[PDB]
Amino acid sequence: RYKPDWESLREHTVPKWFDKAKFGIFIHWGIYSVPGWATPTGELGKVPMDAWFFQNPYAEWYENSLRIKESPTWEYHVKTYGENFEYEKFADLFTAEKWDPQEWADLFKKAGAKYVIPTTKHHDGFCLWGTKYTDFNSVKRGPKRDLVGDLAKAVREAGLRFGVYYSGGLDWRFTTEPIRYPEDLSYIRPNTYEYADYAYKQVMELVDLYLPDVLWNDMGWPEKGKEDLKYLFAYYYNKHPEGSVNDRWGVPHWDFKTAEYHVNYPGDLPGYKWEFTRGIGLSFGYNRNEGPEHMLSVEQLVYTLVDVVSKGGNLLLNVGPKGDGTIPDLQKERLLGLGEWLRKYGDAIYGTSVWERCCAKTEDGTEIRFTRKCNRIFVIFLGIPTGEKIVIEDLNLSAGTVRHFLTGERLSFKNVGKNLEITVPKKLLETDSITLVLEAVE
Amino acid sequence: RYKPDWESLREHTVPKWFDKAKFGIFIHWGIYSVPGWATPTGELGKVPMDAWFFQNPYAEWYENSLRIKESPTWEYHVKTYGENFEYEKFADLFTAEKWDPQEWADLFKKAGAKYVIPTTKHHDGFCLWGTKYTDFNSVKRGPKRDLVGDLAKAVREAGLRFGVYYSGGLDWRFTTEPIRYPEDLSYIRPNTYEYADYAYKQVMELVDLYLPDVLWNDMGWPEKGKEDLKYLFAYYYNKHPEGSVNDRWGVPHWDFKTAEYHVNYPGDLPGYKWEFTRGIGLSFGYNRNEGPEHMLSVEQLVYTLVDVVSKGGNLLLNVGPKGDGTIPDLQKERLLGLGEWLRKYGDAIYGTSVWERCCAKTEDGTEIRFTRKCNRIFVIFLGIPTGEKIVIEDLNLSAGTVRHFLTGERLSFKNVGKNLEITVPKKLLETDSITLVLEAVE
Amino acid sequence: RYKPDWESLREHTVPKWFDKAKFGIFIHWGIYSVPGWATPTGELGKVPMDAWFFQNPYAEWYENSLRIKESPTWEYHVKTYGENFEYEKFADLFTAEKWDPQEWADLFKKAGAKYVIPTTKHHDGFCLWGTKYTDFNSVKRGPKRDLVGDLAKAVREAGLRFGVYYSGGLDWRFTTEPIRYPEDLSYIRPNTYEYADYAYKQVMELVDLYLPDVLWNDMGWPEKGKEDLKYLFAYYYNKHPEGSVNDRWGVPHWDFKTAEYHVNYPGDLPGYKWEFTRGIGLSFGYNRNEGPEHMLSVEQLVYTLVDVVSKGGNLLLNVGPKGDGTIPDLQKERLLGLGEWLRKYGDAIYGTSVWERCCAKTEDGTEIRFTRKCNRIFVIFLGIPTGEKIVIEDLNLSAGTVRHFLTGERLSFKNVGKNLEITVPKKLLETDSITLVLEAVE
Amino acid sequence: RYKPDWESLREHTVPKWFDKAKFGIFIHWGIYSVPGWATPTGELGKVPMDAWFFQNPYAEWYENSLRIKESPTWEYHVKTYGENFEYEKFADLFTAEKWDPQEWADLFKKAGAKYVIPTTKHHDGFCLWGTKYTDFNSVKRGPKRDLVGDLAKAVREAGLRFGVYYSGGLDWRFTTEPIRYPEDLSYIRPNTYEYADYAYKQVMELVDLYLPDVLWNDMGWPEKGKEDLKYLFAYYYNKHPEGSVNDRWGVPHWDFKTAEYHVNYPGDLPGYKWEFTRGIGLSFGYNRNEGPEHMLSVEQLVYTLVDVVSKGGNLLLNVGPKGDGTIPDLQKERLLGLGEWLRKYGDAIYGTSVWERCCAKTEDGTEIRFTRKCNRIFVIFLGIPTGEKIVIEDLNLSAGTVRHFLTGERLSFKNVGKNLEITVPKKLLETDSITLVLEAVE
């Protein structure tokens, strides 16, 4: 039994299932999915913040962008939908006509994800469950259906864990001015006591209807409601000890931390559990402007995953569905690619722990990441070297046997000075898929 | 004029009428009165708290018990009313068909009570007055009548004082999870700001419609609303200086403290004004499972009253009416019994003050309680000794005359050592009713 | 067992000994007693605050007045002691050479007082006990003696209650600027954490060393130390249940309120226990500038006490000794005169309770005050009427026997309308001292 | 880089060295060691708190017991040292004449301990280092030596971790009244700003001078100084990432929880890291009144450690030296015995992790505990069965090979229903020492 207080809540640590699953699927789906439009300006952390809000690569931010008169979105909206076409009007166009929660679940499972977390309410305040605290929800408008619940049922039937995303920190249904600069965030918020209750009542409602595995909050928790989390966290943990929460509440407790695109990405081993998230492209909500030039390629996707996992994190890869519920082909292919690689290399991923170091490199520049499993150490190359002679810089192994992962073949290695030298038979180098994977056993 | 601040509010002390009346009637009446069912497990303070909520002897707690699947109440509810029979449905069955507020008032007056306090809203949130802050009240549902007001009119016309009970601390209309353990109480609460206002607006409303003599709150005051009491207490006291409040608000001010069954019952003279409450049985709300084996007998009732009064308290005895407004015969008889005893011995009760000691005993084990009235000291025996020679242990009187209360007959006494010896003529011992009462005059 | 929190501390109320004693002696004695000088401008409440600090009638305020250059005190100090004579230097002239605490204790007992309260530390920071928290105390300087201690032994020996006075709110040892306007008091205070600690440690030291009957604080408690009082009050009350504290701490608790000269003096019965304090003259500290024209007369003292007492107060009369330890004749006289009247009419004062009303007047304007003791109602005339027929305006006695208090003579009375008429034989009127006192009974 | 705020500090978790060491030595040595006396009333958790402080089994509490006049300690002090012997005087008898920190370090290493934690300052305020914040320390008085310092050099030399104990919650140098009831602890504390500063400055001084591996606070942290810990914890962790703090600060952060004798001792696996602490006898401070009948036996120590360790805890066994610096024979014996068992079975303790369950019992009641190391599961019997056929109640091994840990002998096992049966040849049962230890593998 957890008591409603920070000291006590600290007794709850990231659940084992979370540490072990290493990949999850994020779903930004909503009425913003209908216009499905954003200017693909670039990655968070690379785009200067003075312009960021004016050329927002995040399509879910459509309403905010639309509220900024004369911004690309505003221009696009006027031309395509007209001026007397309010953003809310998209709730009625959002019909999920082609949606089938089971094909989604089926796909995230073939993709190798171990959990799924849909936005139940994003910054625009539209709710994807039949909530009783607002009529701006998917049961009353558009889909005429409890998207959150129906997807929770499919995911779970598919054997995956189910979490929930909630925009606690922002709700444009309670503001009128758009965010034009990052400083605006410190005062352009619901700000009211009424809002702090709404957020509280809404997450409590998600807790009681779906008892999710992850409470994924975004943009901090309304200040007036922060003391409420002591109760909500205790209430939730007492109903679901294996439940978990992220680090976006602005209170003293969290089970795992988060990083988005470049922001907060650790350079080496952070000393805590975390999770990396990004979209397959530059946006989270679907964006019909993104081509594969903006998306990651299965290979980058794989490398991204390995680098995250070697540093102790989980990759929460986002998929951005269309207003009709289908998942754009460019994203489905990248999911399947990654699913394929995980089918071959999963063993050096799921259930692994960090090693003493995350990273290494070969004398010729190929990057190396490590993962552990008791006595086993996985040497994951971010690529497949050409020569049979591999020189790993600044590495010595006290081990004794160094197998070639996929085949199992004992290999020849020698600790030469500050380096490790291994000879990988071209036959083998030729069986690996995106990464050459070795396995030391000490 | 009281100012809205604790230091100032302290200038208000328990009103003289409250100190002097020594007996009041509590009424737990509501929609829980319809099922009128609880398992008579035992008295608060004797029943282990690990089981208490699962076998709740308090019938008003029916909804909480019903929310605990597979608990006696749940089993009983399913069998008797069915699963598709929600607790709220009882608001429509609660018709007070046989209710007559004047017969109630008449009865509490014959019973010797000096004030009356009905639950205006209990933990289930159903309100017994036409409140404007919820439609879950007795004017709109069931009785179709302002129970609170109509009973306030009768009580007052009968010459008694009228107070109000309000579940400030709990409101199941704002929670879904049941209390299974005492620890749950620290987080399973409305918790919202909206709720703190509701409670505030509701007690202010009772203040303006009925200007009650007692603000009897239960289960603490919502934390977010605690600072509001400075205003509400000032507002109330400025409209009714003789009004009063109990000690269940969790703030620095109170006029009298409370104890329930064994909990907080003082062993000797506490140094403050207090009030003891319990039901005639083990429940407050009516319970059709209680037989006289669970109730107190007029004698225990009398002894209970004397012991409370000798220690400076008031006894607030609870009566649990039926859904139709009648008061079960087992309770009416016990009220009348006590009313009868008070008719004979009231003088050594109402208007009395504590003495130097509350308690004493005779050499043969009969317990003695004392009460004062200026120069007069009342020696109230919890029973009627058999022999004409009474030896009171560890007592010496500097008095001079020791009368036999009911008759007035001067008696023979002698301070022998550490004891007091009195000779009570069998004729006299034979006129007393439940207690032998003497009266010293110093 | 009191707990350290306001709700619990509220359980402690004014000790019975305090309510019954009705007169105490205040002693403002310090190094300011040595110059013993002030402009006797008038009574607090009657002198405009725009002038007060510049023409301060309180001689204990000498240091403050002296810091206002060009002030009468400043003129007098330079002419009498020179410019190079720092106020602190008075600690060396303060010798108490002719001091006999037993003589003082006796004088306060003959005077009719039941408790005594000396200034242990006034605003100037000088401590009259061997405190370990500062060297500016009477043990190390001046008297080289613990005045607080020796006086407490002597008061106690005479069988009187001993309380302590402490200036928690001001300590000129922590400031340099004088108080010129009441407004200045809001920022010219010690203000440091250090000071709040000093204050707490010193009052604790006083409780530990002397366990006084009254903790009389003045001028508020340092804001940074207010939370400390929960702990200090619980600590004190647990060592001394019978102890008492006043209402000058600025926190939610106190056992009795206070009034100074005109300030907070009740017009009719307040609903709580209180104490009136003033000097015999206009100062607390000895003022050699006061003559009989600035003092109350024995008649006025008596009239004062009676009025206070009839409104449920205690009179805390101040005496201000000379720097040598002797009590000024003028002051001594008045004390002995009041004592003589208390010797005669004590029984209508000590141990009394307020009646239904405090006041009444005779047809010809003689003010009348009332006190009660059970069934007995004392009728105290502020003076002795000349005629035998007395008409009391707006009184009606439902009693039966009205007697002449001094002799016992039953007297003739008749309820004539909205008045009460009584005949008091001249032989009796001639025996009374300053007050005609009648005793009504039921 | 930790930041000074709870959210960030949460990133720091129990250092890996702590989780792996499984046993440390606590050293309660002070000037209370000189009288070294107490009534060995019983174990915390088993002795009623209404008596505890009056019959305190903790000899370090001598000063507190001594302030309760008419207490066994009081009787013994006056008979043994006289009425005029102030507790502080023990600082001069505390000489550590026969003290050799290297011998101690060695003894704790031979004993099998991995870290040592001496009391740097207990409730009596006496500091065993040359602190600059008080003269009541071991450098200026008694030993005229920095015990903390010399001991830290010596523990480190023996290759053990050194942590520090500090009584932040109590310091009898700041109070005068003894603790008689647990309730008294809520107000008889230093309470001053001054103290909160002293505490912070002293722990800082300890970090600066010795950079300990463990900051072990006791009795809570002064309320006025709690916000200070954000800064002190960030400062400490930034100098010593590998450092650790316990859970007795009363703030939202800690690296491991604690349990004392019966208090907070987990029944099954808690979900966090923790440490059990107790004396070998009933006291922490040396009690010359304890005999073997008051101490654990080597068998019991071993059984204790095993049980703790199987529930993820560390055993923090206390030794209480004599005033002369020598460790009492009885204590030494038990330490060397445990050491001998750790020498044999160390491998089933150090560096282990909890398994799925902590416990199991044999058909005939022998308790069984489990620990794991990767694929290896250690099966520790709290004793050695007499028969060769062993039936473990409610276990089932999906393993394959079960071996006799001491010899390696593979053994015969069969999953018989809800039980596991195994045959352990008597020649093997005869080689075990206090525990039959089996090792299962997969």
Ligand SMILES: C[C@@H]1N[C@H](CNC(=O)[C@H](c2ccccc2)C2CCCC2)[C@@H](O)[C@H](O)[C@@H]1O
């Ligand atoms: C997963 C994504 N989360 C976004 C919230 N983003 C953040 O909190 C971003 C953030 C994230 C982590 C550290 C600092 C800032 C913002 C980027 C500039 C302002 C702060 C959402 O705005 C976005 O629609 C999507 O839900």
Ligand SMILES: C[C@@H]1N[C@H](CNC(=O)[C@H](c2ccccc2)C2CCCC2)[C@@H](O)[C@H](O)[C@@H]1O
């Ligand atoms: C007069 C009765 N008051 C009850 C509230 N009870 C309390 O606050 C009880 C209480 C009362 C006094 C001290 C401590 C606790 C609870 C018993 C265990 C949890 C605390 C109500 O729950 C009950 O229905 C009825 O109104």
Ligand SMILES: C[C@@H]1N[C@H](CNC(=O)[C@H](c2ccccc2)C2CCCC2)[C@@H](O)[C@H](O)[C@@H]1O
């Ligand atoms: C017995 C006397 N008490 C005085 C304290 N007086 C007050 O706090 C007076 C006061 C003001 C309000 C309530 C009660 C008392 C002050 C009149 C000038 C501004 C406030 C002291 O200043 C004085 O030296 C002496 O000790």
Ligand SMILES: C[C@@H]1N[C@H](CNC(=O)[C@H](c2ccccc2)C2CCCC2)[C@@H](O)[C@H](O)[C@@H]1O
């Ligand atoms: C190792 C020992 N630690 C003791 C501190 N013990 C506690 O705080 C005990 C406690 C209470 C609750 C949780 C953890 C520990 C106390 C039992 C009496 C009331 C609370 C010290 O008092 C004792 O002197 C010694 O240093």
